[PDB]
Amino acid sequence: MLKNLRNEIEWFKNNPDYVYLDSGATSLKPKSVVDNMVYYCNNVCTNPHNDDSTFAHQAHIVMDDTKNKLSKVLGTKKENLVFTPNATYGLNSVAHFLKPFFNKGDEIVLTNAEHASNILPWYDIYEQYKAIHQEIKIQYVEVDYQSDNIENFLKKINKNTKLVCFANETNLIGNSIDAIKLASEIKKINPNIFICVDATQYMAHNRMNLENSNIDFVVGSAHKMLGPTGIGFLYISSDLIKPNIVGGGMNFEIKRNYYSLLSGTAKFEAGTANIMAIYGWNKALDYYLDDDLENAKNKIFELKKYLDFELGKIEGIKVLNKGINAFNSIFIKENIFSQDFSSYLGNKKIIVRSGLSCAKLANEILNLDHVVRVSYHFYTNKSDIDKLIKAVKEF
């Protein structure tokens, strides 16, 4: 239950003089997560490449329940999900999967509010292709943070476009885009365009329906979904299911100068899987199958308004994502760099983040190379926000 999340996160009990507002970098972890990871290391501790004993089969069921729960959350099937190390690692696999399908003159429409992991994996195909004397070009959507950013997207898609890589919820600015709506419009311009979404922020707060979505790839991580570090997901449309990583747990038959891929989604999951993280995410995907998801998203939306309004009455404070229903608040203090103001908040025991937060192209939206990001999750309460306002006022 998301309502008693604060009462289940033991972080708040051991560090009760601290205020956590860097939830958009990593999330605090409930007790059920840490305990299920302990149960693996001390009660199971087996490889998922073993099925002889029923002891070894225990881990296999937890993997499928985690994949079934993610299937319910992303609105798809467990036969479409691949366990990736992070989202940066799933986005690099998509780049290395769609690299050979590019031609000269094909375009990649990105955005100025994208993470460095929805930007740099596609620069690499760009510089690689220029060297092989083909030439792809990259188109950058200029974001209005107060818009749906649909026409600002469709104005950059032509008949040469091959990949539309965007993010459902951005990390720094916090604006949200409809993936299904934008995908349908891109598929009415050309139904042969690939669409990859970076839902590492979106899936930390919401759920999706990726069945019949015209989205070919969706990525995300677990350390932002109230889960552990070292595991993420990768959704591949039923048609597209070539493995980027090659090794164990991927082959059907290995001979000399020849090998076969396994049948299913196991061909992309190469090597031993992070079962400890699979155990922790099994207990974290139960908070995302709650009915108070929207009511705990609107509690955060209400706390965003309250901080933004109150910071707007504090002298020398301009909130740059004011007016949108988001899960972060980027603001600047006049004549003070965000690095120094975040250190002031840090000595006041308020953990925030400074800078563009790996969205190093968003200086064209804010006209600033630095911001203070006050990130929220479902466990954020009014007391947390109140103490931030107090510290800002005591500057």
Q: Is 346 in the site for a copy of itself (CB under 8 A)?
A: yes
Angle between the N-to-C axes of helices 382-393 and 293-312, in degrees from 0 to 180, rounded to the nearest 10:
20
* Sites for a copy of itself among residues 100-119 (CB under 8 A): 115-117, 119
Q: Do the annotations mark residue 46 as ligand-binding?
A: no
Subset of 356-395 contacting a copy of itself (CB under 8 A): 357-358, 360-361
How far is Cα 257 from Cα 276, in angstroms, rounded to an integer? 35
Dist. CA 268–CA 275, nearest whole Å: 16
The least distance separating a copy of itself from the CB of residue 323, rounded to whole angstroms, comes to 26
Mask for 268-287, x = binds ligand PLP (CB under 6 A):
---xx---------------
Q: With CB cut-offs between 5 and 8 Å by kind, which of a copy of itself, ligand PLP, none does residue 41 bind?
A: a copy of itself
User: For residues 172 and 320, is the Cβ–Cβ distance under 8 A?
Assistant: no
Paired tokens of 371: 């911001």
Residue 105 contacts which entry, ligand PLP, a copy of itself, none (Cβ below 5-8 A, type-dependent): none
| Number of Cβ atoms within 10 Å of the Cβ of 61 | 10
- Residue pair 263/252 in contact (Cβ under 8 Å)? The answer is yes
- Name the binder of 201 from a copy of itself, ligand PLP, none, CB < 5-8 A by kind: ligand PLP
Q: Which of 151, 239, 256, 313 binds a copy of itself (CB under 8 A)?
A: 256
For residue 309, which phi and psi values (nearest 5 degrees)? -55, -50
Residue ranges in 179-198 that form contacts with ligand PLP under rule CB under 6 A: 198
Side chain identity at residue 107, one-letter code: E
**Residue 88 annotated as binding?**
yes
When CB distances are held under 5 to 8 angstroms depending on the partner's kind, the choice from a copy of itself, ligand PLP, none that residue 343 binds is: a copy of itself
Nearest partner of 331 among 313, 358, 349, judged by Cα = 313
Query: Does the annotation place 223 within a ligand binding site?
Result: yes
Q: What is the CA radius of gyration of the chain?
A: 22
Q: Can you read off the two tokens belonging to residue 115?
A: 């993470």
Question: Is 87 an interacting residue with respect to ligand PLP (CB under 6 A)?
Answer: yes
Q: Answer yes or no whether residue 248 interacts with ligand PLP by CB under 6 A.
A: yes
**Which among a copy of itself, ligand PLP, none contacts residue 43 (Cβ within 5 to 8 A by kind)?**
a copy of itself
